[PDB]
Amino acid sequence: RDDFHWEEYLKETGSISAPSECFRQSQIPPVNDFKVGMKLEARDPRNATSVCIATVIGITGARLRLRLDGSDNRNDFWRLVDSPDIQPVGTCEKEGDLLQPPLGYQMNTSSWPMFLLETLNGSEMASATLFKKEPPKPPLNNFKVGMKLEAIDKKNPYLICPATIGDVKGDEVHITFDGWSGAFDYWCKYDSRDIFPAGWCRLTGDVLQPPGTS
C-alpha cells in the first residue's frame, strides 16, 4: 500500500518496532545486481540435500524469484542475495558434491548430464561478486513480545508482511501477521533470514504488504 509508512503505523498502533540488532539481516542492506535470466546454484527447497541449477525468474528488493532448471513453473521460491542457499555455478563441485536434478525435474533422469550442459550453454552465469556475505548471527535473542517487524508469509513466500512477535521461547519467536488470522502464524529461530526489521522493504525496494483487515 502506498499509504503505509512505519513511523505512522507505529504511532497509530501504539507499538514499537524490533531494533535492527535483533535480526540476522545486514544494517546496510546488500545490493542486488542480479538480472532476470541469470543462472546460479541453489539448494532444492523440496530436497535440502540437493544443489541444483536455478534461473532468476524475477527480482524484488534484495530478493530473487528462482526456478530450478528442468522443473515446472509452480514451485518457484524466493531467496535473499546474501542467502547461504544460493551460490555461483561451480561451487557445488568445490564442496565435494555433484549437482542433482530438481525434485520436480520434468525429464528422464538419464537426460540430466546433457540437460545440464544444454541449459548452461551460452547462458549468463551470475558472478561470485553478486553473492553477498551473510550477516553475522545476533549473539542473543533480543526480541520482546509485542515488537513489530516485517516477516515472510511461509505459506505465500513472495509476501513480506507487517508482523508482531507473539511469543518468545529460547532461541525461537512466534510470528503473527497483523490483520490476519492465526492461520498464518509460525515459530522460527530469532536469526531466521525470513524476518526483517521495520523499514527493510523500503530500504531495499521490496514490496511490503499492507496489514490485513481483521
Ligand X SMILES: CNCCCC[C@H](N)C(=O)O
Binding residues vs ligand X (CB under 6 A)? 153, 156, 159, 161, 177, 180, 184
Decide whether 76 or 153 has the Cβ nearer to ligand X: 153
Q: Which three cell numbers stand for residue 68?
A: 530450478
In the complex, the smallest distance separating the C-beta of residue 179 from ligand X, rounded to whole angstroms, is: 8
Rounded distance, CA 195 to CA 140, Å? 16
In the complex, the smallest distance separating the C-beta of residue 184 from ligand X, rounded to whole angstroms, is: 4
Decide whether 34 or 196 has the Cβ nearer to ligand X: 196
Residue 110, SS3 per DSSP: helix
Rounded distance, CA 44 to CA 29, Å? 25
Rounded to 5 degrees, what are φ and ψ at 156?
-145, 70
Decide whether 105 or 200 has the Cβ nearer to ligand X: 200
Decide whether 112 or 158 has the Cβ nearer to ligand X: 158
Q: Which three cell numbers stand for residue 158?
A: 513472495
Q: Which residue has the cell 481483521?
A: 214
Burial class (CB in 10 A: 0-12, 13-18, 19+), 27: exposed
Decide whether 159 or 168 has the Cβ nearer to ligand X: 159
Rounded distance, CA 168 to CA 145, Å? 7
Helix residue spans in the chain (DSSP H): 6-13, 91-94, 112-120, 200-204
Decide whether 9 or 184 has the Cβ nearer to ligand X: 184
In the complex, the smallest distance separating the C-beta of residue 13 from ligand X, rounded to whole angstroms, is: 17
State which H helix or E strand residue 164 sits in.
strand 156-169
In the complex, the smallest distance separating the C-beta of residue 156 from ligand X, rounded to whole angstroms, is: 5
In the complex, the smallest distance separating the C-beta of residue 193 from ligand X, rounded to whole angstroms, is: 18
In the complex, the smallest distance separating the C-beta of residue 178 from ligand X, rounded to whole angstroms, is: 9
Q: What secondary structure letter does DSSP report for 73?
A: S
